DNA sequence: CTATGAGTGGCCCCTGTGGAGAGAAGCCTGTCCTGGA
DNA sequence: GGGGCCACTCATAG
RNA sequence: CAGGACAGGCUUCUCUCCACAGGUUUUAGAGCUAGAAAUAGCAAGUUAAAAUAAGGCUAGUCCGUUAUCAACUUGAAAAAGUGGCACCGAGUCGGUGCUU
């Protein structure tokens, strides 16, 4: 007997509740065979459970990482281009200059040359540092000096500018409103440049040097004043780097805001601080040359600086003068945003098409790459296809034929009522055409009043007319027609249908391209039809937007019997006056058949693909995929006998997918047979049912709430479509044996944390490069654990290197995953493991589960940390009492019910002791947090006289201790409780390892104690 | 007497801005139209 | 939020 | 009942590409005086290079944190197969009966 059964769903962002109920709303239970080497061969379990899992994440951070990687690569490539250009002359004076530059980061031991990067000697380095303390001094020198400078300094300055080229936010080259914008640019410069009157072509360097001089004088005055007046804090401010004083501001991690906050109260006390106070108010005190306010610098300033430097220095180095165009290109070149990555097809994010196959350089970009076809594919690859014509691209928003369609379709169902008319009448084709010609071609917008005055009364001589269908004014407008009438000024050309193709082509050309030159190039085919001024003004007009329909749909196909296009039908359709929607579904015409032929019998959509094809967060994609997997697994459990019904814009997608997978058989009339019906509901009804019948939901006690919500969803839906039931549900809610499963997942992402810590002496430092000793250069810390593997072997230990049989878990970082998978044995031996027993290697992902004595459970969080693996079960009556006490002062309802609930809360106050005792018993038995538990016990008797509502609310805080997963710290009234972290994983090495199905119904237990038995 | 492990408590986590485009979703109003019952 | 690491404290086995 | 379309307005979210500004680490930027040293005092502090997930080969001005992944068997992978039910009670499930 295939028992009638249904499956309900309660889908959340991280939670997917499932439950199967019979016609009596009862969840049955079955005995499941257990595989493995353990004595427990079969466990009976209830057909209810849920899956908790990590939230899905969007690739936005990954996209930022990719963009940053491209930024770094292209900046380095610019450096390489400059270095190659400078290479030829560099060899004559200093061949090791570029050799010194690349290897400066190395220690003196690792340097193959002298440690000084600039000159390779100390005396000249000191002289250079003395003459030009900052790079801005060198920049101002080069901008102002006419003298021939060393090429090394020139290269350094140019590389500095190139590496910090600045923003391209202002285009071009830098009446009354025009003078106003010039003054705005002057204000921008004054923000950038603080030297207003100096005769210089590079005011930015002057501004930086003036800032440095102010910093010097301010520091001198401040040190003098502090020494004179507050000697005790001298060493604190100026020597103690750990504080937010000057030492921390410059040498430590203290920033500008921190420095100002630290120094303001101190400056409030000494003499002569008025200027210092104002400077702090203007944020001009001791300003660094590298802040976050330099981001407003136009790249045109850097271009001018380069141009001036080259202008001054071209007289002595002819190769600089002859390569000035290339250097200016390197500084100025920006990859067009419509082109894309310069890949040879092998990059999944590349769309560029090449004219030739040479190496792309900033000097030969355009001639090698078809920017026209590049933008053509760029726009096209991101547009959509018509649903009725899957193989056709959509027309632009402002297509003239599209406007014709819109105007005619809006005018189609216009009903007019005049004197003597018993019923409203439709507009004839002649009437509609006359209306369009008289008003729409003359008015950018047409209202009801305008129509009544201009056509009904002036033309058809109807003194009184009633208009229906549109309230105020007609939405469709021939705005593009008005613009083309304004520009072309040839109404006969515009109204000639022989020009329809040309007009549509021009509109598409205007829509596709944003660059003026390409638009002019493509439209030059029509230069013989229009004058020069029209061509110029056409080069100026632009539009945006894309519609939903293609040219083929409206004017491409024709009816077999009549041959009228959709435009023809909308112009006049007889007395039927069928609009677009009516026309495309009428059986009397062949348009529907044309759409069906256009509809391609598509391949069975991959479940991975279709979920990846819906619009939404990837998190809901993961949730839906897991839910479908759960559905399939549950069906497979029941002998593949399909259920009756399912109760659940994600909902409709779930419904369609479930119907597609379940209902696949077609009847004698080729109609899909729906043996399973999808039932759609929302949370409001179920919450109302809960509040009506005291089935209260608490989201802090345990995770049984998800499964209970799914169970209620199914019950309510089945009852809706279709005493004892209340009691059955109550028994269901109190059932402790509930399948709670955390999805095991192999961790991905970054190799380690992003903080680069200073050098130390420990084995945990991770080298940033292959040839870089961590103790010499520091590196990363806290690598991310990929998963764990069980190893039973012998390891040499102690001074004597005595091999000792061991049984331990080694943490695999994500970075070394490939090396481990390539050859596990060699990778283990590289770590010193010997006599590896490969047959016993078990791969354990994160959240691996372990069974210990008395049912105590732990989840493998990482290599050396565990998580609580047990769930707190509480009786229903206590949950109801806690709910009533929690909302005791927030009751919203009839006063009688509120007073009854208050009396019930007062009567059973003694439940508090039972709750505390049960929590303490659970803690002692499975949690082992004796100190924190005793703290809680002391706190309970401390505040036993407190108001009941606060007591219950702070007890709700206590369930944080029994929460599954990572332990967390929480506060109880005035008592703070810290988190209990289990740092020892040795005990689970002899525990019971269980592997469960994604629903946990199928399971396999492996006893780790038996493995590696001596 | 030194090295090994076995808890305990405490602190640490890269951030900020611009431009271009395309798409989707929801809500509201009006005109509506098609499939079924 | 949640795991890792540092510094500190203490028992241990050789 | 659902769907679909046009227009207008509002809001929210998703994806791709082009950019800019910093920070971090390490090194360089002669520390001096008196004192054997511990140490005390003095002087100075704004800048510079490289890397910024280890790297790979398809050697490109490309790719490397999205997505996906219980266990066994087959399959390179993709993909496929692998485990009884009925009744009674319930503290992490247990008990009863039948076939296999």
């Amino acid at each position: 007997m295939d028992k009638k059964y249904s499956i309900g769903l309660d889908i959340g962002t991280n939670s997917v509740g499932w439950a199967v109920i019979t016609d009596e709303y009862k969840v049955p239970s079955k005995k499941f065979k257990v595989l493995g080497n353990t004595d427990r061969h079969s466990i009976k379990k209830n057909l209810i459970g849920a899956l908790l899992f990590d939230s899905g994440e969007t690739a936005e951070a990954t996209r930022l990482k990719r963009t940053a990687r491209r930024r770094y690569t292209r900046r380095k490539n610019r450096i390489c281009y400059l270095q190659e250009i400078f290479s030829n002359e560099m060899a004559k004076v200093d061949d090791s200059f570029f050799h010194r530059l690349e290897e400066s980061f190395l220690v003196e031991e690792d340097k193959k040359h002298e440690r000084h990067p600039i000159f390779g000697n100390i005396v000249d380095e000191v002289a250079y540092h003395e003459k030009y303390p900052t790079i801005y001094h060198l920049r101002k020198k080069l901008v102002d000096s006419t003298d021939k400078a060393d090429l090394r300094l020139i290269y350094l300055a140019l590389a500095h500018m190139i590496k910090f080229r600045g923003h391209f936010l202002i285009e071009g080259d830098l009446d009354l409103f025009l003078a106003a914008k010039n003054l705005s640019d002057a204000i921008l410069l004054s923000d950038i440049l603080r030297v207003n009157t100096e005769i210089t072509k590079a005011p930015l360097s002057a501004s930086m040097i003036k800032r440095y001089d102010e910093h010097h004088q301010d520091l001198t005055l401040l040190k003098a004043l502090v020494r004179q007046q507050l000697p005790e804090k001298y060493k604190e401010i100026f020597f103690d780097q750990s504080k937010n004083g000057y030492a921390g501001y410059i040498d430590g991690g203290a920033s500008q805001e921190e420095f100002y906050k630290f120094i303001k109260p101190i400056l409030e006390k000494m003499d002569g601080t008025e200027e210092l106070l104002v400077k702090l108010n203007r944020e001009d005190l001791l300003r660094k040359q590298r802040t976050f306010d330099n981001g407003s610098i136009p790249h045109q300033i850097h271009l001018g600086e380069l141009h001036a430097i080259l202008r001054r220095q071209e007289d002595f180095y002819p190769f600089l003068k002859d390569n000035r165009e290339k250097i200016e290109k390197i500084l100025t070149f920006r990859i067009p945003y419509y082109v894309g990555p310069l890949a040879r097809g092998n990059s999944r994010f590349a769309w560029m098409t090449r004219k030739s196959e040479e190496t792309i350089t900033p000097w030969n970009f355009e001639e090698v790459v078809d920017k026209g076809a590049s933008a053509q594919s760029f726009i096209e690859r991101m547009t959509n296809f018509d649903k009725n014509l899957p193989n056709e691209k959509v027309l632009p928003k402002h297509s003239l034929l599209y406007e014709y369609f819109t105007v005619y379709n809006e005018l189609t169902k216009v009903k007019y009522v005049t004197e003597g008319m018993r019923k409203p009448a439709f507009l004839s084709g002649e009437q509609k055409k006359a209306i369009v010609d008289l008003l729409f071609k003359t008015n950018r917008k047409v209202t009801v009043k305008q129509l009544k005055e201009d056509y009904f009364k002036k033309i058809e001589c109807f003194d009184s007319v009633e208009i229906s269908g549109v309230e105020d004014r007609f939405n469709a407008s021939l705005g593009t027609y008005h613009d083309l009438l304004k520009i072309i000024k040839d109404k006969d050309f515009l109204d000639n249908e022989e020009n329809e193709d040309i007009l549509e082509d021009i509109v598409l050309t205007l829509t596709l391209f944003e660059d003026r030159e390409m638009i002019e190039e493509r439209l030059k085919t029509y230069a013989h039809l229009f004058d020069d001024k029209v061509m110029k003004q056409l080069k100026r007009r632009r539009y945006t937007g894309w519609g939903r329909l293609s040219r083929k749909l409206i004017n491409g196909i024709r009816d077999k019997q009549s041959g009228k296009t959709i435009l023809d039908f909308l112009k006049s359709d007889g007395f039927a006056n069928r609009n677009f929607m009516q026309l495309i579904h009428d059986d009397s015409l062949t348009f529907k058949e044309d759409i069906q032929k256009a509809q391609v019998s598509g391949q069975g959509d991959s479940l991975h693909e279709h979920i990846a094809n819906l619009a939404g967060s990837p998190a809901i994609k993961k949730g839906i995929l897991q839910t479908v997997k759960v559905v399939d697994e549950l069906v497979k459990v029941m002998g593949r006998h399909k259920p009756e019904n399912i109760v659940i814009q994600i909902t409709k997608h779930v419904a369609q997918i479930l119907d597609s997978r379940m209902n696949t058989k077609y009847d004698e009339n080729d109609k899909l047979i729906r043996e399973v019906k999808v039932i759609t509901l929302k949370s409001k009804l179920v919450s109302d049912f809960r509040k009506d019948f005291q089935f209260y939901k608490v989201r802090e006690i345990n995770n049984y709430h998800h499964a209970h919500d799914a169970y209620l969803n199914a019950v309510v839906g089945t009852a809706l479509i279709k005493g004892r039931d209340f009691a059955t549900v109550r028994k269901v809610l109190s059932m402790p044996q509930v399948n709670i499963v955390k999805k095991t997942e192999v961790q991905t992402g970054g190799f380690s944390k992003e903080s680069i810590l200073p050098k130390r002496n420990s084995d945990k430092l991770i080298a940033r490069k292959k040839d870089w000793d961590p103790k010499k250069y520091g590196g990363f810390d806290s690598p991310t654990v990929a998963y764990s593997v069980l190893v039973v072997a012998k390891v040499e230990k102690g001074k004597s290197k005595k091999l000792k049989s061991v049984k331990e878990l080694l943490g695999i970082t994500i970075m070394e995953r490939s090396s481990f998978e390539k050859n596990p044995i060699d990778f283990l031996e590289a770590k010193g493991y010997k006599e590896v027993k490969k047959d016993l290697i078990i791969k354990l992902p994160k959240y691996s589960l372990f069974e210990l004595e008395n049912g105590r459970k732990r989840m493998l969080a990482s290599a050396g940390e565990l998580q609580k693996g047990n769930e707190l079960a509480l009786p229903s009556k206590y949950v109801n009492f806690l709910y009533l006490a929690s909302h005791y002062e927030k009751l919203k309802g009839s006063p009688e019910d509120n007073e009854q609930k208050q009396l019930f809360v007062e009567q059973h106050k003694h439940y508090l002791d039972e709750i505390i005792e049960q929590i303490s018993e659970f803690s002692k038995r499975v949690i082992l947090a004796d100190a924190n538990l005793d703290k809680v016990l002391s706190a309970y008797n401390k505040h036993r006289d407190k108001p009941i509502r606060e007591q219950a609310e702070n007890i709700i805080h206590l369930f944080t201790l029994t929460n599954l997963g990572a332990p967390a710290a929480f506060k109880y009234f005035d008592t703070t409780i810290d988190r209990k972290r289990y740092t020892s994983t040795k005990e689970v090495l002899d525990a019971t390892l269980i592997h469960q199905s994604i629903t946990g119904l199928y399971e396999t237990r492996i006893d780790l104690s038996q493995l590696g038995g001596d």
Side-chain angles (χ1 to χ4, degrees), chain A residues 470-486:
Chain A
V470 182
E471 277 190 338
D472 288 328
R473 66 183 182 194
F474 291 88
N475 288 316
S477 62
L478 298 179
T480 306
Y481 182 94
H482 288 287
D483 290 338
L484 293 181
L485 185 65
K486 256 184 174 184

Side-chain angles (χ1 to χ4, degrees), chain A residues 585-618:
Chain A
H585 292 310
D586 197 321
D587 294 315
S588 70
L589 301 180
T590 75
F591 283 144
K592 210 165 189 172
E593 294 294 328
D594 309 328
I595 287 148
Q596 296 147 25
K597 299 151 198 156
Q599 296 328 106
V600 183
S601 179
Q603 294 81 17
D605 198 348
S606 178
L607 184 63
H608 181 253
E609 263 175 351
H610 189 34
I611 297 170
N613 292 340
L614 295 178
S617 80

Side-chain angles (χ1 to χ4, degrees), chain A residues 765-867:
Chain A
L765 288 178
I766 305 164
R768 293 193 294 152
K769 292 293 182 181
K770 191 183 177 190
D771 315 310
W772 291 2
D773 179 2
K775 296 179 181 176
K776 297 183 178 185
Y777 301 112
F780 302 116
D781 193 4
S782 309
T784 307
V785 176
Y787 55 86
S788 305
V789 293
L790 181 69
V791 183
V792 183
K794 295 182 184 162
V795 176
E796 288 180 10
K797 259 182 178 173
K799 286 186 177 181
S800 57
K801 296 189 173 190
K802 282 188 177 184
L803 277 154
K804 244 184 178 183
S805 303
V806 295
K807 177 183 177 186
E808 65 183 11
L809 296 183
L810 181 67
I812 307 304
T813 68
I814 296 172
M815 190 173 68
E816 292 169 324
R817 178 181 172 191
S818 304
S819 186
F820 175 79
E821 288 179 347
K822 187 180 180 185
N823 191 341
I825 300 300
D826 296 9
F827 181 92
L828 290 173
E829 289 183 355
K831 290 220 178 195
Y833 295 99
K834 297 188 175 186
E835 300 177 31
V836 182
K837 294 189 181 182
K838 188 178 180 180
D839 306 325
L840 302 184
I841 298 174
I842 303 178
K843 181 174 179 169
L844 296 172
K846 195 182 178 196
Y847 315 121
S848 292
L849 183 67
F850 304 90
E851 186 168 1
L852 282 73
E853 75 296 340
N854 298 329
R856 181 168 68 109
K857 294 180 181 181
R858 295 293 183 259
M859 296 186 300
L860 191 68
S862 73
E865 191 165 10
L866 300 175
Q867 295 186 2

Side-chain angles (χ1 to χ4, degrees), chain A residues 749-1009:
Chain A
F751 296 154
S752 64
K753 288 184 179 177
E754 300 184 0
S755 301
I756 304 168
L757 299 176
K759 66 182 183 178
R760 294 180 294 172
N761 288 348
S762 178
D763 306 315
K764 297 190 178 186
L765 288 178
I766 305 164
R768 293 193 294 152
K769 292 293 182 181
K770 191 183 177 190
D771 315 310
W772 291 2
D773 179 2
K775 296 179 181 176
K776 297 183 178 185
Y777 301 112
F780 302 116
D781 193 4
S782 309
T784 307
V785 176
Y787 55 86
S788 305
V789 293
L790 181 69
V791 183
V792 183
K794 295 182 184 162
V795 176
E796 288 180 10
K797 259 182 178 173
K799 286 186 177 181
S800 57
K801 296 189 173 190
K802 282 188 177 184
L803 277 154
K804 244 184 178 183
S805 303
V806 295
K807 177 183 177 186
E808 65 183 11
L809 296 183
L810 181 67
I812 307 304
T813 68
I814 296 172
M815 190 173 68
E816 292 169 324
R817 178 181 172 191
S818 304
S819 186
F820 175 79
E821 288 179 347
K822 187 180 180 185
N823 191 341
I825 300 300
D826 296 9
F827 181 92
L828 290 173
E829 289 183 355
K831 290 220 178 195
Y833 295 99
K834 297 188 175 186
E835 300 177 31
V836 182
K837 294 189 181 182
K838 188 178 180 180
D839 306 325
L840 302 184
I841 298 174
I842 303 178
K843 181 174 179 169
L844 296 172
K846 195 182 178 196
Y847 315 121
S848 292
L849 183 67
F850 304 90
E851 186 168 1
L852 282 73
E853 75 296 340
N854 298 329
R856 181 168 68 109
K857 294 180 181 181
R858 295 293 183 259
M859 296 186 300
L860 191 68
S862 73
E865 191 165 10
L866 300 175
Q867 295 186 2
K868 299 171 289 176
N870 297 86
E871 289 279 13
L872 174 64
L874 286 178
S876 306
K877 62 170 183 160
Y878 302 134
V879 182
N880 290 351
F881 174 82
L882 283 174
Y883 180 91
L884 291 176
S886 60
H887 298 77
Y888 188 94
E889 299 173 358
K890 298 178 185 165
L891 294 173
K892 294 189 178 189
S894 72
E896 289 174 340
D897 268 335
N898 291 344
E899 293 179 353
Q900 272 192 355
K901 288 166 189 162
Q902 285 175 344
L903 199 84
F904 175 86
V905 169
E906 289 189 355
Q907 287 177 355
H908 297 258
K909 185 178 178 180
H910 63 278
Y911 285 4
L912 295 169
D913 289 329
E914 295 179 22
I915 290 162
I916 291 290
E917 196 169 30
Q918 289 198 13
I919 290 168
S920 183
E921 279 196 330
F922 181 85
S923 185
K924 286 173 182 174
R925 188 172 63 118
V926 306
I927 304 300
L928 306 180
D930 306 330
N932 292 44
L933 181 63
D934 292 339
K935 283 181 179 185
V936 167
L937 294 175
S938 183
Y940 179 68
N941 287 333
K942 195 181 180 188
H943 301 275
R944 209 175 186 184
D945 303 325
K946 285 277 195 152
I948 299 172
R949 177 184 158 201
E950 196 184 349
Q951 297 200 25
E953 286 178 355
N954 280 281
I955 285 170
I956 291 167
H957 303 166
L958 297 181
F959 299 125
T960 309
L961 181 66
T962 57
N963 276 348
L964 188 85
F970 61 96
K971 277 188 171 189
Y972 182 67
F973 295 97
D974 292 331
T975 306
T976 303
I977 308 301
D978 275 319
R979 62 181 180 170
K980 176 64 176 186
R981 297 177 69 187
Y982 308 105
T983 59
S984 179
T985 54
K986 287 188 176 187
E987 63 176 357
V988 306
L989 297 173
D990 305 318
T992 303
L993 172 65
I994 309 178
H995 295 289
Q996 296 180 297
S997 68
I998 197 166
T999 62
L1001 296 176
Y1002 293 118
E1003 62 184 37
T1004 302
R1005 294 183 173 225
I1006 304 176
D1007 180 7
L1008 299 181
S1009 76

Side-chain angles (χ1 to χ4, degrees), chain A residues 362-375:
Chain A
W363 314 298
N364 71 354
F365 182 55
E366 297 275 73
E367 65 183 1
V368 175
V369 176
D370 205 317
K371 64 182 181 293
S374 294

Side-chain angles (χ1 to χ4, degrees), chain A residues 372 375-377 379-381 383-384 392-402 480 484 499-515 518-520 522-523 525-526 538 541-547 549-552:
Chain A
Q376 198 39 65
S377 52
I379 300 298
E380 286 181 351
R381 77 192 298 248
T383 59
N384 289 325
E392 301 295 336
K393 284 290 187 172
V394 296
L395 285 171
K397 189 179 179 183
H398 297 103
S399 178
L400 271 162
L401 188 153
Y402 201 90
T480 306
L484 293 181
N499 298 328
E500 189 188 292
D501 281 324
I502 300 171
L503 294 172
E504 287 299 307
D505 186 62
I506 289 167
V507 175
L508 180 64
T509 295
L510 297 177
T511 307
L512 283 173
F513 305 102
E514 192 178 4
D515 189 333
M518 292 192 296
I519 293 168
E520 182 169 31
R522 270 198 174 195
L523 293 182
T525 47
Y526 308 121
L538 284 172
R541 195 68 181 172
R542 291 187 182 175
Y543 293 113
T544 60
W546 298 84
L549 307 179
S550 63
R551 184 174 181 185
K552 186 175 179 179

Side-chain angles (χ1 to χ4, degrees), chain A residues 645-648 651 654-656 658-659 676-680 721:
Chain A
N645 290 317
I646 301 185
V647 176
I648 62 171
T651 75
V654 176
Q656 304 139 16
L658 281 187
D659 186 74
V676 182
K677 296 181 181 183
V678 185
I679 306 161
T680 57
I721 290 183

Side-chain angles (χ1 to χ4, degrees), chain A residues 374-583:
Chain A
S374 294
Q376 198 39 65
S377 52
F378 169 75
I379 300 298
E380 286 181 351
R381 77 192 298 248
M382 297 186 290
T383 59
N384 289 325
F385 292 94
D386 192 335
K387 286 188 174 190
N388 307 297
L389 299 179
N391 294 333
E392 301 295 336
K393 284 290 187 172
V394 296
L395 285 171
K397 189 179 179 183
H398 297 103
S399 178
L400 271 162
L401 188 153
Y402 201 90
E403 287 187 348
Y404 281 124
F405 165 82
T406 56
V407 170
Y408 280 111
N409 192 50
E410 192 171 15
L411 287 176
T412 296
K413 294 302 179 191
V414 179
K415 295 180 180 181
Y416 69 99
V417 171
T418 63
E419 286 177 7
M421 293 182 72
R422 288 187 179 183
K423 290 186 179 181
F426 292 114
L427 298 171
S428 78
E430 291 181 344
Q431 286 176 323
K432 288 175 188 174
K433 189 176 179 180
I435 290 162
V436 171
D437 291 332
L438 279 153
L439 301 180
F440 282 90
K441 293 184 176 180
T442 57
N443 301 102
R444 280 190 176 219
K445 276 184 176 173
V446 182
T447 64
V448 173
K449 194 179 179 185
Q450 282 168 310
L451 185 67
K452 289 182 178 191
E453 291 178 1
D454 295 321
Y455 179 77
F456 280 112
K457 195 171 186 167
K458 286 181 181 161
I459 306 296
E460 292 179 353
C461 300
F462 298 152
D463 275 323
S464 77
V465 64
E466 281 197 339
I467 300 187
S468 62
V470 182
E471 277 190 338
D472 288 328
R473 66 183 182 194
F474 291 88
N475 288 316
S477 62
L478 298 179
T480 306
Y481 182 94
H482 288 287
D483 290 338
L484 293 181
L485 185 65
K486 256 184 174 184
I487 294 169
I488 299 173
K489 304 185 178 183
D490 187 344
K491 192 180 176 187
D492 293 339
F493 185 88
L494 290 170
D495 288 348
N496 187 357
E497 292 188 340
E498 295 184 344
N499 298 328
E500 189 188 292
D501 281 324
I502 300 171
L503 294 172
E504 287 299 307
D505 186 62
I506 289 167
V507 175
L508 180 64
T509 295
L510 297 177
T511 307
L512 283 173
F513 305 102
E514 192 178 4
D515 189 333
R516 295 189 196 166
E517 293 183 346
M518 292 192 296
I519 293 168
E520 182 169 31
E521 195 176 21
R522 270 198 174 195
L523 293 182
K524 266 175 182 173
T525 47
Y526 308 121
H528 64 281
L529 296 172
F530 306 123
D531 70 36
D532 288 334
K533 202 177 187 176
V534 172
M535 288 295 287
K536 200 176 186 180
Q537 285 185 345
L538 284 172
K539 202 181 179 187
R540 289 169 181 195
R541 195 68 181 172
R542 291 187 182 175
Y543 293 113
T544 60
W546 298 84
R548 292 286 188 168
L549 307 179
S550 63
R551 184 174 181 185
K552 186 175 179 179
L553 184 68
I554 295 171
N555 208 33
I557 60 172
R558 295 179 180 264
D559 171 62
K560 285 180 182 169
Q561 184 177 2
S562 65
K564 293 185 176 186
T565 67
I566 287 177
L567 185 61
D568 298 322
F569 280 112
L570 292 174
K571 286 175 179 178
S572 183
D573 195 28
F575 293 105
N577 201 41
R578 292 167 289 192
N579 76 356
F580 173 68
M581 284 296 295
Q582 286 174 299
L583 290 168

